[PDB]
Design a protein around this ligand. Structure first.
Ligand SMILES: Nc1ncnc2c1ncn2[C@@H]1O[C@H](COP(=O)(O)CP(=O)(O)OP(=O)(O)O)[C@@H](O)[C@H]1O
Ligand SMILES: Nc1ncnc2c1ncn2[C@@H]1O[C@H](COP(=O)(O)CP(=O)(O)OP(=O)(O)O)[C@@H](O)[C@H]1O
Ligand SMILES: [Eu+3]
Ligand SMILES: [Eu+3]
Lengths: 195, 199
């Protein structure tokens, strides 16, 4: 539990289209959609042994390599799997909310995922009033920024991550001058399916 | 922690700082951890004393609720929230001072820490979100977006509130009123920067 510098893999995944689609539905329905979603995303993380740090609205933050130790390679492999697995759950969901009037009648829901790996102080943070497990540092910023920057329905990763990823699975490369970062960063959109 | 999602009138408060890793850049990891907590430790005390709820921590950001899970009059909601922000803004100056004199800031040119707070009141489906495997207490909806956006938009070391909130605030305590068009919102919104001090 106690905060410490460790090498971990952060995964952020947010959606775009929620608000507007539930725009119709009495909060009640809205809650039904969000939980459904969250229920899914969570499944993709736990099945791939990751840790669900937190939920920031419709955003999911997940860790790999903390609290439980995990090899930097297993970290990138499981962070990737979740991302692709999550992409499959939405399709499965968007398919159901479509056929149901919660979508299509309000564009279907879009997905944005960004993953990064690097050092980050990992521990319990907060105080007596409230204290949660989470990572903190420039590396967390990075992953997050990577996720806000990638195209809709895509997965973007840092070079640190891509080095574990087969070459032909990397769709597109590009340096991004991420806020607060001096050194522009090399980003990689990875194929959303595999090999 | 057993509350199923329900619409409700609550007051959301978001407060974020700036000068963390920059200041902490000046220390090794455990150094930031010792620092971040000192901060949060204070931020949270300002929420609890004013009887607010601490939804979550998003890094150096604090999300706090007023009017959930515990019922609270829309007026008490705005009074306890405003107070909290005012109390927060003072401890910051109190902290910065501590750090400056500690050489964590105002040295190796890491400017002292800045604060951003945005508050709004409105409807929001409050409750446990997620699913059996995982679910947390939080509010969801356009009203949450609003507060958050209000906080990202206000100047450094300032408190910005929506009209919905300002109507409970004495007129002379409102430094500025100005329409700012927020993302995803059709109707531009009337914002109010309130005096960081009472009266
Ligand atoms: N329950 C919650 N906890 C924390 N932050 C929340 C939240 N609900 C909303 N927010 C904040 O409100 C803002 C939500 O706006 P956006 O993330 O831009 C929605 P979007 O991704 O553009 O489309 P969407 O509304 O369909 O998801 C974010 O800045 C988020 O941090
Ligand atoms: N523990 C955590 N949980 C969730 N999100 C986190 C996080 N730590 C960092 N982040 C994310 O990383 C990003 C941090 O970027 P910023 O908030 O812009 C830093 P800043 O406000 O410019 O000043 P700073 O460098 O002192 O932090 C945010 O989008 C935040 O949500
Ligand atoms: Eu979103
Ligand atoms: Eu910040």
């Amino acid at each position: 539990m106690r905060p410490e510098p460790r090498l971990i893999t952060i995964l952020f995944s947010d959606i775009v289209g929620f608000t507007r689609m539930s725009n119709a539905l009495q909060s009640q329905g809205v809650a039904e959609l969000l939980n459904e979603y969250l229920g899914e995303m969570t499944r993709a993380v736990f099945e791939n042994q990751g840790t669900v740090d937190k939920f920031v609205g419709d955003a999911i933050m997940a860790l790999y390599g903390a609290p439980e130790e995990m090899s930097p390679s297993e970290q990138v492999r499981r962070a990737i799997a979740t991302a692709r697995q999550m992409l499959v759950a939405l399709e499965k969901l968007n398919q159901g909310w479509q056929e149901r009037g919660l979508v299509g009648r309000v564009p279907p829901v879009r997905f944005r995922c960004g993953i990064h790996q690097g050092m980050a102080v990992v521990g319990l943070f907060g105080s007596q009033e409230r204290s949660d497990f989470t990572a903190i540092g420039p590396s967390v910023n990075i992953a997050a920024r990577l996720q806000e920057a990638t195209a809709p329905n895509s997965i973007m990763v840092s070079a640190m991550v891509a080095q574990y990823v087969p070459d032909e699975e990397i769709i597109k490369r590009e340096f991004l001058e991420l806020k607060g970062i001096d050194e522009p960063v090399m980003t990689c959109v990875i194929n959303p399916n595999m090999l």
